[PDB]
């Protein structure tokens, strides 16, 4: 695709497709320049344009690629905070690669790994750049992602509950409490653990947990 041309005009076309959204041709010409004038300063400005469109294009592999390449290219750069947030964004994006939830679907139960990666990125942000232009967005992504992992683990426990491994269950509920007694999944799960213990006559813990959700009967 790449027509070689004056580099100023290369960045010109890049910005054209940028304001428009033709992420394909934009990324083509940007990569063209960083094949033509790659180690130049505004060529990492070109690289920022690249990561920008790569997400705007919903092209996540090269997104991770160029973002990490930018990090290894600079520990702290003008746009590096936006880069950090965009990394968190593309990770959480991988976690929502599919969007079936509106076909009457749930995603609270698939792979909880990119969610851990995004949770980490937003942690490193909320305490590593915790004054950015992206504070509360990341913050609410944080809280939601967290109750999301929560409901995930809760569903897992429910599974086992239907299986029988009441010990596995109890441990899941525990590890959830020790990762959270806040996220709705907590109050959701609690009876899981309780009937579990009941499947084990460890009724002591059962009524203890009963009082637990009792004081938290909401």
């Amino acid at each position: 695709e790449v027509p070689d041309n004056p580099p100023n005009e290369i960045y010109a076309t890049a910005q054209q497709k940028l304001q428009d959204g033709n992420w394909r041709q934009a990324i083509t010409q940007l990569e063209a320049l960083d094949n033509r004038y790659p180690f130049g300063p505004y060529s990492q400005q070109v690289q920022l344009d690249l990561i920008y469109a790569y997400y705007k294009n919903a092209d996540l592999p090269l997104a991770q690629a160029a973002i990490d390449r930018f990090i290894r290219l600079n520990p702290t750069h003008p746009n590096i905070d936006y880069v950090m947030y965009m990394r968190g964004l593309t990770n959480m994006a991988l976690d929502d690669s599919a969007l079936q939830g509106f076909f009457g679907v749930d995603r609270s139960d698939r792979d909880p790994q990119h969610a851990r990666a995004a949770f980490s990125d937003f942690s490193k942000l909320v305490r590593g750049y915790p004054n950015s232009q992206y504070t509360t967005d990341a913050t609410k992504r944080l809280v939601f992602l967290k109750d999301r992992l929560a409901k995930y683990e809760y569903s897992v426990a429910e599974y086992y509950t239907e299986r029988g491994a009441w010990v596995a269950v109890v441990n899941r509920v525990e590890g959830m409490l020790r990762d959270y007694p806040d996220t709705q999944a907590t109050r959701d799960a609690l009876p899981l653990m309780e009937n579990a213990y009941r499947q084990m006559q460890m009724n002591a813990q059962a009524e203890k947990v009963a009082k637990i959700i009792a004081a938290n009967s909401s």
Binding site: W166, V167, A168, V170, L177, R178, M200, Q201, Q205, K208
Partner: protein
């Protein structure tokens, strides 16, 4: 009442009668832990007490729980031993 098809309850963290005799009173936390492998059941919020569970039924014929649970004082010291078989 017309299903011979049932599984066997493949859950453990069980006990050996060896494991039974393996521990006596006031034996310290780390000591007993190594002497019996780490546990997996212990109150989220109560004392240091510990549980240890055996679990099975081979399908339609009796369910064999066998848990010993294990009380523990402040300073990681055993305080009481508490077994329980099926039912």
């Amino acid at each position: 009442e017309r299903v011979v098809y049932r599984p066997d309850i493949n859950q453990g963290n069980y006990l050996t009668a060896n494991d039974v005799s393996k521990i006596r009173v006031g034996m310290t936390q780390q000591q007993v832990a190594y002497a019996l492998g780490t546990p997996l059941m212990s109150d989220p919020f109560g004392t240091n007490t510990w549980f240890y569970v055996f679990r099975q039924q081979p399908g339609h014929e009796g369910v064999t729980q066998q848990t010993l649970t294990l009380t523990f004082n402040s300073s990681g010291v055993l305080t009481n031993i508490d077994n329980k078989p099926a039912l």
